[model samples]
Target: ENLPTYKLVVVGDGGVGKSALTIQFFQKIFVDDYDPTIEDSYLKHTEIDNQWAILDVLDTAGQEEFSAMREQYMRTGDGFLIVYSVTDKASFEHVDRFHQLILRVKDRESFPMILVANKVDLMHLRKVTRDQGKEMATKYNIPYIETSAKDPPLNVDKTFHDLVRVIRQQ
Candidate 1:
């Protein structure tokens, strides 16, 4: 019953629902607001492309103290999901830095990663548009997905599996 392992890291600014999305995918629960940020990790057996595999997800809650340790964590990631909130302009902007930082740490021209536009459920509060998100994904040359960790999670599982697909591509 051994499954191949995939180390997937979720990177993003705090309050962008990183914990919310991770929890929804694993525990099937959505935190209403302000998920108490901390170092959280989850190990789940999942199927991707109909193949059984283990997903070890590292959700760095973006606590202020760990800013210097970003590279250390990124080094061990097999793939990544860089999440940014549609309602937070600064978080969206931070994605560019996150993107470059991962590549620098990985020492690759490109690596398996995805651009996640999260909190799309907050339609009225949206500061970033779909096309803009697509444009950012295009720049990174990675697949872009829209998601909401709301009561009815959208693309939460897909995001994880898709990153698995991306990693398998390599």
Candidate 2:
């Protein structure tokens, strides 16, 4: 029997580990050194409810020069994980604009989204606080979670799980 599948897109600035996150979620392995590639991946999981689900994860280019392509990429997604590096204030500053663009492409009042403050392992160099990320999440009425590629492997894995949970709820 085939299970229902969901499409999830991860969008953010380059070097935020969006690709790494996707690989970790899909392959259950984190490659410390991997090439940067933006493409689609297939991941399958059986939820706690015993429902098997297929996840179609799209990793997009993160460079500022790719904003136009990014918008186009967002148009076809069912849900998103807007990630920003906690150590990079510029990424956080661009959250609103990113959200606006997503809303435009989504062409809906609200679609499922998650505010991801990634690279949390650099706590000493962190410029964005959890409360601040939470505040933004609250303002947008979506859930927020902090992620780190360095620490626990499950950090990235769990965020994707949360995204699946949110999508399943919709």
Tens digit per residue, CA lDDT, model 1, 20-48: 89889988998766445676788988788
Write model 2 residue lDDT over 32-100, tens digit each, in one string: 666555455565655734677767777776463654445444677778999898888888888887798
Error of 1 at 116 (Å): 0.3
TM-score of 2: 0.84
Model 2 alpha-carbon drift over 4 Å, by segment = 37-40, 43-48, 62-73
Candidate 2 Cα deviation (angstroms), residue 37: 5.5
The global C-alpha lDDT for each of the candidates, from Candidate 1 onward, is: 0.87, 0.77
Residue 143, model 2: lDDT of 90
Clashing pairs in 2: none
